[PDB]
Design a protein around this motif. Structure first.
Motif, PDB file in Angstrom:
ATOM      1  N   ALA A  11       0.838  -1.205   0.000  1.00 62.58           N
ATOM      2  CA  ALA A  11       0.000   0.000   0.000  1.00 62.58           C
ATOM      3  C   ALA A  11       0.878   1.262   0.000  1.00 62.58           C
ATOM      4  N   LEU A  12       2.015   1.239   0.719  1.00 66.31           N
ATOM      5  CA  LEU A  12       2.940   2.375   0.787  1.00 66.31           C
ATOM      6  C   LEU A  12       3.638   2.607  -0.542  1.00 66.31           C
ATOM      7  N   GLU A  13       4.150   1.530  -1.193  1.00 66.05           N
ATOM      8  CA  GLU A  13       4.781   1.619  -2.520  1.00 66.05           C
ATOM      9  C   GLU A  13       3.797   2.184  -3.549  1.00 66.05           C
ATOM     10  N   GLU A  14       2.542   1.666  -3.556  1.00 65.39           N
ATOM     11  CA  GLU A  14       1.460   2.110  -4.458  1.00 65.39           C
ATOM     12  C   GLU A  14       1.224   3.617  -4.289  1.00 65.39           C
ATOM     13  N   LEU A  15       1.178   4.071  -3.023  1.00 64.98           N
ATOM     14  CA  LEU A  15       0.982   5.463  -2.631  1.00 64.98           C
ATOM     15  C   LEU A  15       2.168   6.351  -3.051  1.00 64.98           C
ATOM     16  N   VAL A  16       3.388   5.941  -2.711  1.00 63.94           N
ATOM     17  CA  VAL A  16       4.605   6.690  -3.016  1.00 63.94           C
ATOM     18  C   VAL A  16       4.833   6.787  -4.508  1.00 63.94           C
ATOM     19  N   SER A  17       4.598   5.700  -5.271  1.00 63.42           N
ATOM     20  CA  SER A  17       4.763   5.712  -6.737  1.00 63.42           C
ATOM     21  C   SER A  17       3.802   6.707  -7.388  1.00 63.42           C
ATOM     22  N   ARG A  18       2.634   6.912  -6.759  1.00 64.48           N
ATOM     23  CA  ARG A  18       1.586   7.818  -7.216  1.00 64.48           C
ATOM     24  C   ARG A  18       1.897   9.269  -6.756  1.00 64.48           C
ATOM     25  N   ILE A  19       2.212   9.484  -5.454  1.00 63.55           N
ATOM     26  CA  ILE A  19       2.484  10.812  -4.871  1.00 63.55           C
ATOM     27  C   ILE A  19       3.842  11.393  -5.252  1.00 63.55           C
ATOM     28  N   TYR A  77      -6.595  13.072   2.604  1.00 65.96           N
ATOM     29  CA  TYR A  77      -7.723  13.795   2.030  1.00 65.96           C
ATOM     30  C   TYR A  77      -7.642  13.860   0.506  1.00 65.96           C
ATOM     31  N   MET A  78      -6.477  14.289  -0.020  1.00 66.95           N
ATOM     32  CA  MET A  78      -6.219  14.475  -1.443  1.00 66.95           C
ATOM     33  C   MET A  78      -6.177  13.177  -2.245  1.00 66.95           C
ATOM     34  N   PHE A  79      -5.737  12.066  -1.644  1.00 76.56           N
ATOM     35  CA  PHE A  79      -5.656  10.792  -2.368  1.00 76.56           C
ATOM     36  C   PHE A  79      -6.722   9.754  -1.900  1.00 76.56           C
ATOM     37  N   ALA A  80      -7.862  10.242  -1.365  1.00 75.90           N
ATOM     38  CA  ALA A  80      -8.975   9.417  -0.867  1.00 75.90           C
ATOM     39  C   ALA A  80      -9.877   8.839  -1.971  1.00 75.90           C
ATOM     40  N   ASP A  81      -9.832   9.429  -3.177  1.00 72.04           N
ATOM     41  CA  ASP A  81     -10.642   8.983  -4.311  1.00 72.04           C
ATOM     42  C   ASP A  81      -9.808   8.264  -5.393  1.00 72.04           C
ATOM     43  N   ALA A  82      -8.574   7.849  -5.033  1.00 74.07           N
ATOM     44  CA  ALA A  82      -7.638   7.159  -5.926  1.00 74.07           C
ATOM     45  C   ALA A  82      -7.850   5.641  -5.909  1.00 74.07           C
TER      46      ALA A  82
END
Length: 284
Positions: free
Chosen positions: A166-174, A279-284
């Motif tokens: 979940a962290l890798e998925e998030l970091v690769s996106r952010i 908040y900003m990545f809640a609809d991803a």
């Protein structure tokens, strides 16, 4: 009314408004009222009147059924081991690399009976019954903390693997630049993020900062919020990270982010940033 005064107003009532207390605790808990606040926020001590010495006795009933310089004391270390040993016995589906998790609860409950400099305090100076209360309270408040993340400590630790993915998925996106920098020097997320999940970032921060971080975690379901704190933590250090030009230097920095001088300000800034990301990545 001051921050400390607002809390003392909330905690002097027979019935505590848990929702107002959680709201007041999200930006941090004053040191003076943290022990009673953690007992309430964890759910260990119920807020309304409609119990404590019995919960304490229940813990010693499990022990009876069986029959940093503060942390360099053999009694303190044996207490840490006992609490985890009892916890392990009480959770047969379930770690050992979570001995650290007891530490913030022990320091917070010890601070209730110790004026100043709890770092150099000799526990053989406290009464046996006071020390027993600290031990039982740390067990029950750590049990409440672990209940939310039980998937982390079951067979093959699925919660941690899923959380690191979940962290890798998030970091690769952010922050794809940081993500690609890890890929360039073959740094796998599990090589640094496993411990961030397993120990709830306490191996990356001074103890005082972990205590302040856990005020917010306890004022929340936080298991998902931690993922955004870990992401914010990587982004906070993105320049130092991108300045690393080798696997070894990069991994070393990732496991030892320079937070030694951090306090309440930096944790508050880290949490506000983690909320913005969630908040900003809640609809991803």
């Amino acid at each position: 009314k001051t921050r400390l005064e607002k809390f003392r107003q909330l905690l002097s009532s027979q019935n505590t408004d848990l929702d107002e207390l959680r709201k007041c605790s999200w930006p941090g808990v004053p040191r003076e009222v943290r022990p009673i606040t953690w007992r309430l926020l964890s759910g260990y001590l119920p807020a309304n009147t409609e119990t404590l010495q019995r919960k304490r006795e229940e813990y010693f009933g499990f022990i009876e059924q069986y029959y940093i310089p503060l942390f360099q004391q053999p009694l303190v270390q044996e207490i840490f081991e006992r609490i985890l040993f009892i916890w392990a016995i009480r959770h047969p589906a379930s770690v050992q690399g979570i001995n650290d998790l007891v530490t913030p609860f022990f320091v917070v409950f010890l601070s209730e009976y110790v004026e100043e400099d709890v770092e150099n305090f000799d526990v053989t100076n406290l009464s046996q019954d006071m020390l027993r209360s600290i031990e039982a309270d740390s067990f029950w408040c750590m049990s409440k903390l672990l209940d939310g993340i039980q998937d982390n400590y079951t067979f093959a630790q699925p919660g941690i693997q899923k959380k690191v993915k979940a962290l890798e998925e998030l970091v690769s996106r952010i922050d794809e630049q940081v993500h690609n920098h890890f890929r360039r020097y073959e740094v796998e997320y599990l090589q640094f993020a496993f411990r961030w999940m397993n120990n709830l970032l306490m191996r990356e921060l001074p103890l005082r900062c972990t205590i302040r971080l856990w005020d917010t975690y306890q004022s929340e379901g936080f298991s998902h919020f931690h993922l955004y704190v870990c992401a914010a933590f990587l982004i906070k250090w993105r320049k130092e990270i991108l300045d690393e030009e080798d696997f070894q230097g990069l991994l070393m920095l990732l496991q030892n982010l320079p937070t030694i001088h951090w306090g309440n300000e930096e944790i508050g800034l880290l949490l506000a940033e983690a909320y913005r990301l969630k908040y900003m990545f809640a609809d991803a």
